[PDB]
From a paper:
Central to this pathway is PepI, an F420H2-dependent oxidoreductase. PepI first catalyzes the formation of the central statine, then produces the C-terminal statine moiety. Among these, the homolog kvPepI from Kitasatospora viridis DSM44826, with 53.3% sequence identity to PepI, was more amenable to study. Through comprehensive structural and biochemical characterization of PepI/kvPepI, we confirmed that PepI/kvPepI sequentially reduces the middle β-ketone followed by the C-terminal β-ketone or methyl ketone.
The His imidazole moiety likely acts as a proton relay through substrate protonation via the His62-Nɛ2 position and interaction with the carboxyl group of the Glu126 sidechain via the His62-Nδ1. Accordingly, the H62A mutation abolished the PepI activity. To rule out the possibility of H62A mutation causing a loss of activity due to allosteric effects, we also solved the structures of kvPepIH62A and kvPepIH62A in complex with F420, which are virtually identical to kvPepI apo and kvPepI-F420 complex structures, respectively. Taken together, these findings strongly support the role of His62 as the proton-donating residue. Site-directed mutagenesis and kvPepI-9 modeling studies support the role of His62 as a potential catalytic residue, as corroborated by the abolishment of enzymatic activity regardless of whether 9 or 13 were used as the substrate.
Residue numbers in the entry:
A (entry chain B): 25 to 185, 197 to 304
B (entry chain A): 25 to 189, 195 to 304
Amino acid sequence: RPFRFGVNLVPTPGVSSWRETCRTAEQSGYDVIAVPDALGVHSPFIAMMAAAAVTERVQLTTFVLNSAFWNPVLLARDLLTAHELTGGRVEAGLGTGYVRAEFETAGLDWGTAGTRVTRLADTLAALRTLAVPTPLMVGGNGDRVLGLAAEHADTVSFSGARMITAEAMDERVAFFAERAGERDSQVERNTLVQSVIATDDRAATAKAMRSRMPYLTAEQILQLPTLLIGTPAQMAETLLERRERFGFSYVCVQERYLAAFAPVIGLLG
Amino acid sequence: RPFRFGVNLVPTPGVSSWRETCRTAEQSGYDVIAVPDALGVHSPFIAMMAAAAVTERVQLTTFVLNSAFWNPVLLARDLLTAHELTGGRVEAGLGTGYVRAEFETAGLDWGTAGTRVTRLADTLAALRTLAVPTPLMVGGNGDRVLGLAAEHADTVSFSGATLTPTLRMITAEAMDERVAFFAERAGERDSQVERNTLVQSVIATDDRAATAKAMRSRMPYLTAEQILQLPTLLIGTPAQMAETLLERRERFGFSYVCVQERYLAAFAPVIGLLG
Ligand SMILES: C[C@H](OP(=O)(O)OC[C@@H](O)[C@@H](O)[C@@H](O)Cn1c2nc(=O)[nH]c(=O)c-2cc2ccc(O)cc21)C(=O)N[C@@H](CCC(=O)N[C@@H](CCC(=O)O)C(=O)O)C(=O)O
């Protein structure tokens, strides 16, 4: 699948630069602006509408909704509206929600880990039953969640982080592919790269980073799917290898790396 | 011909930086500011006047006008006005138009490729008959369009990409044929017509070979060697890029080179070296 690149922007209360930041993302060549779903951050669909007003090309996605925060029928109302009123530019990433303090603050039942996955499952089933027009992404590495992505999702998002080894990712991607079966080729695979480390000596940088990861070898650090290290050409070759190995074609980076990663889009976008 | 360097800027509604952007282009050493003709973009001659008020040296050009948008007599009025009220600093690039939704939004007939090219031909003939004082550029790679450039234009702009009326980059070998086609049509007038091309990407790198290899992902129909010869791409250090542009002026005759707004700063070092 052809590469698509996203940047995870955080619309922050009291910060007045939202429109400018979204323009910079589009002008820098990103294909997708992604926003989170958290307390203390701007509301995601409202922020996406403000982004749509100052951009023309990028897709706009949640990355990812906390299923505990949304009533499925009312979420389907939101998604239909966001689709129609942006001209079809909205996608919806969903996940389980993992911060207990946010449930407590909002007066929601934390339940059990399995109850929180069932909330995601029930939401996915309802959104498909209501035929929402927005493409759906499912994120999370748990067995059941990956099964739900295999069943319902247009895009599956794998977490790379406690950074996951390339060998551990092999096992999660293989587990997903077994669940997806004959659907496998119809599901785009996403991951979020947590750090983009520009360096003219990736070998020395990796060896030095054993300071913060003494439990990994330098080769293991250079193979961590959530880290990209080196020059733009090296980073592009790393992403090409990771698309072959893991199937990852939809790659997101964090806001602080927007400019650091942009040269890679010039080679692969 | 001596090199001339342009940057294609997009004057955008709701973005208050137009004057600042135009001054940066001139201060960075560009010879030309180019603006498009599209719905949703600021109106081209009005944006050009705003640019002329804050710059002193650069030429200002359309790059390129959608011929379906303009009545030839009224366009001649605009061109004479722009010429006199800027002191001779305006040039007009013209093309056929190619985005069907813009025709439809403006209530214009998309028609056929034939009718869109005939509209360009009719407009060029009328502008020459009205003796407009602005230099005229004609852009596009179709046989009829390059024939019109050979007949009428002061500058011919060779497109480095095709797209069903997204972009597919054309090889250096195909560009060789397009330049030779134009030259044959131009005949004795060939040497009086400046040749332009737009570079789509300016990629600063210390490993041009590794860069080109990776870029095959975006252009699977090309080899790395072909990527390094694409006229729409500049790859390497500023010195390597300057040497490439010298080689491409000898191979293709390209002396008027434009880059896209995103690469304004990336390309400016090359201007330093070629001057
Ligand atoms: C559409 C284009 O024809 P062209 O003569 O090369 O260019 C015509 C116009 O697009 C051109 O004159 C300009 O108006 C376009 N143009 C702009 N046009 C505008 O209207 N506004 C602009 O601001 C503008 C800017 C601009 C900047 C640079 C540039 O190079 C062109 C620009 C083209 O891609 N032609 C292909 C043919 C494409 C086609 O018809 N079919 C496809 C599919 C084949 C099939 O399925 O049948 C193909 O042959 O590959 C070709 O010659 O090979």
